[PDB]
Amino acid sequence: EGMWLMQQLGRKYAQMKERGLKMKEYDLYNPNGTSLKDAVVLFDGGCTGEVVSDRGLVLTNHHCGYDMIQAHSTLEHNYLENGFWAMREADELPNKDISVVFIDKIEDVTDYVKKELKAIKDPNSMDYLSPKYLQKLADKKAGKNFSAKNPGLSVEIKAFYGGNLYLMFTKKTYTDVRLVGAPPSSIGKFGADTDNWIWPRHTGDFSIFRIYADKNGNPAPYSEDNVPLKPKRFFNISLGGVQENDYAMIMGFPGTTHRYFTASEVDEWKSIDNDIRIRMRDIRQGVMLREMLADPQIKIMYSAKYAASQNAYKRAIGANWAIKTRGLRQNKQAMQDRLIAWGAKQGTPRYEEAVHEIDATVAKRADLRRRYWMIEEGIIRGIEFARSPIPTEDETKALQASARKEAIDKIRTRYSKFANKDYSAEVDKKVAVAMLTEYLKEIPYENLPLHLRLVKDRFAGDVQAYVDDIFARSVFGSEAQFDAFAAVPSVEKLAEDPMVLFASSVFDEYRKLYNELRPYDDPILRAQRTYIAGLLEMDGDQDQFPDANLTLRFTYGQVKGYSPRDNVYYGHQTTLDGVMEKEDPDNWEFVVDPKLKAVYERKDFGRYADRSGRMPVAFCATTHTTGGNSGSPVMNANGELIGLNFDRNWEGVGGDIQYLADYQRSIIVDIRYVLLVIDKVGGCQRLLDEMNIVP
Amino acid sequence: DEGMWLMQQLGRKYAQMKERGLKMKEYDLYNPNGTSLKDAVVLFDGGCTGEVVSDRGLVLTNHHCGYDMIQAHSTLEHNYLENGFWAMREADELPNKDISVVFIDKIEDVTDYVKKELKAIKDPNSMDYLSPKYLQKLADKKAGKNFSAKNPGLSVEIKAFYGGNLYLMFTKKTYTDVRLVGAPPSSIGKFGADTDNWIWPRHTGDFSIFRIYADKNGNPAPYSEDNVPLKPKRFFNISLGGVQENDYAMIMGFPGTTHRYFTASEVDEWKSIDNDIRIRMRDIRQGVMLREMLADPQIKIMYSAKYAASQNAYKRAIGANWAIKTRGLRQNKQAMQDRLIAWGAKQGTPRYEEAVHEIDATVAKRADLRRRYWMIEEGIIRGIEFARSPIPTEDETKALQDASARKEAIDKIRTRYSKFANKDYSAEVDKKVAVAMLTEYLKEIPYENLPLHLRLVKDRFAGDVQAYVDDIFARSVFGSEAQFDAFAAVPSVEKLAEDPMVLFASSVFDEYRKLYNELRPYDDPILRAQRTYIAGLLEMDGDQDQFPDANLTLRFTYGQVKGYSPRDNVYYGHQTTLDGVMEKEDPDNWEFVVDPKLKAVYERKDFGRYADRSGRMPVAFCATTHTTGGNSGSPVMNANGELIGLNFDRNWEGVGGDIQYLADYQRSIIVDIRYVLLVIDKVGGCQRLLDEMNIVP
Numbered sequence A: 001e002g003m004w005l006m007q008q009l010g011r012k013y014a015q016m017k018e019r020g021l022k023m024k025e026y027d028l029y030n031p032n033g034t035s036l037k038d039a040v041v042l043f044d045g046g047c048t049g050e051v052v053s054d055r056g057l058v059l060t061n062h063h064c065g066y067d068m069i070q071a072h073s074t075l076e077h078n079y080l081e082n083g084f085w086a087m088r089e090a091d092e093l094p095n096k097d098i099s100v101v102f103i104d105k106i107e108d109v110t111d112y113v114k115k116e117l118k119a120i121k122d123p124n125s126m127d128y129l130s131p132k133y134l135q136k137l138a139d140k141k142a143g144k145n146f147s148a149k150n151p152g153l154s155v156e157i158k159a160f161y162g163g164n165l166y167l168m169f170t171k172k173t174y175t176d177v178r179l180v181g182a183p184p185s186s187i188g189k190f191g192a193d194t195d196n197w198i199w200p201r202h203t204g205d206f207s208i209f210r211i212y213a214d215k216n217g218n219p220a221p222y223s224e225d226n227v228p229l230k231p232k233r234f235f236n237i238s239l240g241g242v243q244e245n246d247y248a249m250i251m252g253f254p255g256t257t258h259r260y261f262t263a264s265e266v267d268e269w270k271s272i273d274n275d276i277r278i279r280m281r282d283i284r285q286g287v288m289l290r291e292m293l294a295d296p297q298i299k300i301m302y303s304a305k306y307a308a309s310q311n312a313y314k315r316a317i318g319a320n321w322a323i324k325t326r327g328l329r330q331n332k333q334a335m336q337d338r339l340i341a342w343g344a345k346q347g348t349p350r351y352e353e354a355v356h357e358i359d360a361t362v363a364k365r366a367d368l369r370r371r372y373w374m375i376e377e378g379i380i381r382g383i384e385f386a387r388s389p390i391p392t393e394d395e396t397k398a399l400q401a402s403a404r405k406e407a408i409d410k411i412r413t414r415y416s417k418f419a420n421k422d423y424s425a426e427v428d429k430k431v432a433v434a435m436l437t438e439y440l441k442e443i444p445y446e447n448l449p450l451h452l453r454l455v456k457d458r459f460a461g462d463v464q465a466y467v468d469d470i471f472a473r474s475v476f477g478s479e480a481q482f483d484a485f486a487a488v489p490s491v492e493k494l495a496e497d498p499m500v501l502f503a504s505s506v507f508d509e510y511r512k513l514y515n516e517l518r519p520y521d522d523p524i525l526r527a528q529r530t531y532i533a534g535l536l537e538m539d540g541d542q543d544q545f546p547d548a549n550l551t552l553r554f555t556y557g558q559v560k561g562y563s564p565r566d567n568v569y570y571g572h573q574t575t576l577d578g579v580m581e582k583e584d585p586d587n588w589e590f591v592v593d594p595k596l597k598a599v600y601e602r603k604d605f606g607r608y609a610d611r612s613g614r615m616p617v618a619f620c621a622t623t624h625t626t627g628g629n630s631g632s633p634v635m636n637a638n639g640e641l642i643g644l645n646f647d648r649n650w651e652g653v654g655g656d657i658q659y660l661a662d663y664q665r666s667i668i669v670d671i672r673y674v675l676l677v678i679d680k681v682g683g684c685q686r687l688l689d690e691m692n693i694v695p
Numbered sequence B: 001d002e003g004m005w006l007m008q009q010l011g012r013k014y015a016q017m018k019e020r021g022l023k024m025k026e027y028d029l030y031n032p033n034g035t036s037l038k039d040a041v042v043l044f045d046g047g048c049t050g051e052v053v054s055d056r057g058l059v060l061t062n063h064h065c066g067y068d069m070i071q072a073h074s075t076l077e078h079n080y081l082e083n084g085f086w087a088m089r090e091a092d093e094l095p096n097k098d099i100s101v102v103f104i105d106k107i108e109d110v111t112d113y114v115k116k117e118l119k120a121i122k123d124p125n126s127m128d129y130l131s132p133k134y135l136q137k138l139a140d141k142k143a144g145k146n147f148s149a150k151n152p153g154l155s156v157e158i159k160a161f162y163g164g165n166l167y168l169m170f171t172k173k174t175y176t177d178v179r180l181v182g183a184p185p186s187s188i189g190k191f192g193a194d195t196d197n198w199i200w201p202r203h204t205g206d207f208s209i210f211r212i213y214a215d216k217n218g219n220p221a222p223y224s225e226d227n228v229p230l231k232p233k234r235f236f237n238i239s240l241g242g243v244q245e246n247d248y249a250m251i252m253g254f255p256g257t258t259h260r261y262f263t264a265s266e267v268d269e270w271k272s273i274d275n276d277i278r279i280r281m282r283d284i285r286q287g288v289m290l291r292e293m294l295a296d297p298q299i300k301i302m303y304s305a306k307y308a309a310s311q312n313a314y315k316r317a318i319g320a321n322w323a324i325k326t327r328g329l330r331q332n333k334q335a336m337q338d339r340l341i342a343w344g345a346k347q348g349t350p351r352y353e354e355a356v357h358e359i360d361a362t363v364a365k366r367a368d369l370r371r372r373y374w375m376i377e378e379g380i381i382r383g384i385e386f387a388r389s390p391i392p393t394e395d396e397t398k399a400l401q402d403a404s405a406r407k408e409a410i411d412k413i414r415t416r417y418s419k420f421a422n423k424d425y426s427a428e429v430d431k432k433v434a435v436a437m438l439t440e441y442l443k444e445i446p447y448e449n450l451p452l453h454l455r456l457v458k459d460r461f462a463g464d465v466q467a468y469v470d471d472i473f474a475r476s477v478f479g480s481e482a483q484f485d486a487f488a489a490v491p492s493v494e495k496l497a498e499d500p501m502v503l504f505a506s507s508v509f510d511e512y513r514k515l516y517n518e519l520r521p522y523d524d525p526i527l528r529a530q531r532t533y534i535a536g537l538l539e540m541d542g543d544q545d546q547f548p549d550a551n552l553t554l555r556f557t558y559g560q561v562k563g564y565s566p567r568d569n570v571y572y573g574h575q576t577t578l579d580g581v582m583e584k585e586d587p588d589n590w591e592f593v594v595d596p597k598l599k600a601v602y603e604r605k606d607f608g609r610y611a612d613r614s615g616r617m618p619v620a621f622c623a624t625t626h627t628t629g630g631n632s633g634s635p636v637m638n639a640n641g642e643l644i645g646l647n648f649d650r651n652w653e654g655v656g657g658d659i660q661y662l663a664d665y666q667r668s669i670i671v672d673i674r675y676v677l678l679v680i681d682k683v684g685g686c687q688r689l690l691d692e693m694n695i696v697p
């Protein structure tokens, strides 16, 4: 059920041992010595990775190394669709703007931070959560010249439990991380968008990198003279596999959770955040689908935007299903009622007062938050011409010297980015007409962005006429209209431009709403400090984990399937047979790599097939993961790598508020399938040879 | 494979059924010379199956089986289709016009009789051995002089089995006063609606209740206010013990058609002509309908039923093609014929290999014609609504070219025009469907093979299908109401003879009939060769593990209550529960609305004796029994012959089961009798129905 601090391993070890953990406590996490924790990395600031060899070889997800695979892909060498397999270390490709972070040391600095905070004076100061304040405290504790005296190292203090616990992290950052291997996109992204958040899953979501360092193993930026890093710890790869009920554990960097949400925050998340996103994205996607189906060129241009909009749309449907069916609201209400009853018995009213504060803040910001999500989903992300060019003060105070020509070239560059190869003005007019019709129905005249008042005032409520007029009269309505403006540019024309007035107007309202809503975050945050303090003083930091905050956590559970609906069971493991079942050569998402199809046909599975002779692909577990856990190592009872976490099922997206024991599963790619692809698809024996594989 | 057996075959199957869990005595299930459970099975309304469940002629069948009767008694005041119907006294049970219930009184093997009569051969190619007229003349000869008058209510029928190698005479008792007694609301009776059609897991309460009425002596009689409920020879006991995984289950019913003795060439043809054309043309048709229904809520109202009707056989063809592709249907037919050919060679009898060769040669020879037939049938005859636009008859045309019969001909044409262009017909949607359907048709069928009017696309319109379709509506008398009324005011035969829509409709129907008439002669050689082929198969392996094709006659099937794995890592269990209904609830979707009385029963856990050991309320179960169309409403029996459910469907992974049964995929979808009795009790409040049934603990 939790994403536990490394400090909490001692207090959990007995339960983990009872659940099947066989390895020694300090072999997994040692606060003053080398442990498995030392083989886990924060890959590129978002994902998780793991060192799997004495030469700094790193495994992470395909979707984690995707941008690096794309940056090295050309028409001649398409590594994104064909995969990449460096046959020698010298062929491994460097990547600009990449990093891996090791968590060298972690220390509890709560009493230190709390004593330093006593000098605040203002009781409403948000410095207790300030990265700038906490960094000044971190520097004070580590030393004046710490990073110079210890090169490659850095320190960081973070708040936990709403400001009730502080930890200082000593981090080692490496920035020369080279691409080593990757399967074709047909394996690394088999499900593509259709199987996103879906279990059963048949995706071989992996990519291989290598950490490079100076001659002494110290961090260094890219240099042709850099040598592979020899790390203090790396994972052994297990080929024993997984069985139903086997103990499994994960270490990674989960980003965010909302485990201490009040019932009023769950109602708000449902009725504002989720309902608006679901409603507006359904209108948007519905118009895009009609147009993509009727024009193959519109399908080419809008496919990525349609898919990108569907991602959080699906997430919201999954989250709303949990709120409706799993009693998320009720369990938060039972949590706060229990604390309020305990606080009454103790004579301490501050907990009930803190919950009341959160409820009152949520109730007070309701109309503003609704208006914010309405403009964000409806216009800011719903209508493409909302992001059309807005002339800067420097650009207008240049049009009215040959600085007119420089201003027009800056505006033209922005206009070409807006109206690009994938932009259709006709599709955008249709999307805007349906999105604005819904927006104008939900937001009243007095609350409208100033230009949208023209729908009622100038166009007699004709949204189609208003949108037609924007394009017919705007200098950004067509290339010919822009070139006619660029030939005779007047600031007066730009000041009255219907598209510029629309774009400026909707961005004014969006910022006015954001700035009005920001002050409401602080009272909730301060009240959460008292609320979480109350929950911990009552039931303890034992069965209630601190919210995820992009810091190193461990989670444990078992390899186990689940029943999604009545009379249906999804088992714990997928096989290569499921990939072949899903094959569709006329659907880009489900095309099967010919080399992999041949391996399956010839049953050339080597030492990677299971006891039944079937080739495993992926498995699922009752571990508690969220975003940030992509690429996380999955370990055996002995701490051996059995897979890489790459997703979680949709029935568990509400797991960031309330973990769902009977539905929530981590979707992991089986390490045996990883090695099978490296071996039989990539032919990269050198990678297999440098890993320590156990029978 | 795992058959639909003749009642005659129960004797030689009994030992296997007993070993599979059957506990009842052989003759208690079927006895040719006495009362048996077979006597409680009926052919409900000529298509479905039913079963007598009380000593007062109460009958259970499916909701989709009694649907037309429930609809005929429904008005905007007493809507029985939407709210259900529960007659609180026998006098309140509603009579139904044109309904029937057929009992199978006796069944007799008349093979030697028919085969001896057939020896009086005028031609060895005579198809009389399969002729309903010929076999009826033989049936009447055996039964006697005016049998129907001497034995009222009774009738006799001879049917061919095993391709003409076995004949059975059936003595049938027909009752035509069958009254509606009870029915759940449509929200239960068709819970899945079209979404869950052919789907397992399934949560549908597919049942309806009727009653057989007869004269004072229990003899068949048409509706009369003086008719009294039938006291039957035999009725089923209802079991409340339920079902468990692996339990023995059996069904009796009237499966309609199977193709178990198809050659590999017939499976290839079924796939590449029948199924591929139906899939291709229906996808074009449905695609255009969907775009129009989504853009106009009034077009959704008008085209919803046509869209759903087209999707039905479309989905079935997708499921059938999946089995051909994944379950080795072709290969198993090839292995069947290769094995017979090898055995025939060893015996010195070449007639079996010659018979298979005949079938293959006929299939290869009719390929282009059959492709052209399915192309015009799926593409135009079904695909385009103005293909069924009015065509003036020879006598209608004649009446227009000097009497008061001109106004009679115009009123007949107007009546047909109003039926074509009705409240659900949109000329704009039809022009769009026709433009896409004809574009595909013209791409597949060459100029020399086109219906004569479709040649105008190339000749007169320079290949512009949109212009050709636009011209048909712009110039036709049936293109709009105003165009028709202008014709009706000044009707000339010359105008009708040149009408572009009339010429299109006539032209496509000419080609459709020319193709049908050319293809008909090819059925006979295949049929005659199948007589030799099935004779060989039976002489080689026996009528023991190869059942005769279904032909709308009484059959039994047995298996077990068992689920299956549809795909990797997914298991569908053997039983659905009331929780699955509540999980599927969607108040803003007519298909998944949950009846308020039922939702509260679930909330209250008011399940009585109808819940399982764990306290869960069962809804439906599935079994490895071999069923097909005609088996809707079939009784499902226990090891003891007690009613445990009613068959109402089969899963799509098993639609290829009519050619080859699929042990690991094919399941009969049955509504649990405990859920039937729960709905009668807690939703209908009809205690009198529960009281007249014999329910066992």
Ligand SMILES: CC1(S(=O)(=O)N2CCC=C(F)C2)CC1
Pocket (backbone or CB within 6 Å): A196, A197, A198, A314, A315, A316, A317, A318, A319, A650, A651, A653
């Ligand atoms: C809309 C759904 S989905 O498309 O299955 N979806 C999958 C991806 C993520 C989710 F959260 C949900 C039925 C719930």
Ligand SMILES: CC1(S(=O)(=O)N2CCC=C(F)C2)CC1
Pocket (backbone or CB within 6 Å): B197, B198, B199, B314, B315, B316, B317, B318, B319, B320, B652, B655
């Ligand atoms: C995509 C499919 S289907 O075509 O909707 N299916 C529906 C039920 C009847 C069938 F025969 C097939 C599931 C296979």
Ligand SMILES: [Cl-]
Pocket (backbone or CB within 6 Å): A038, A102, A230, A231, A232, A233
């Ligand atoms: Cl290291």
Ligand SMILES: [Cl-]
Pocket (backbone or CB within 6 Å): B348, B349, B350, B351, B352
């Ligand atoms: Cl012979």
Ligand SMILES: [Cl-]
Pocket (backbone or CB within 6 Å): B327, B661, B662, B663, B664, B665
């Ligand atoms: Cl099978």
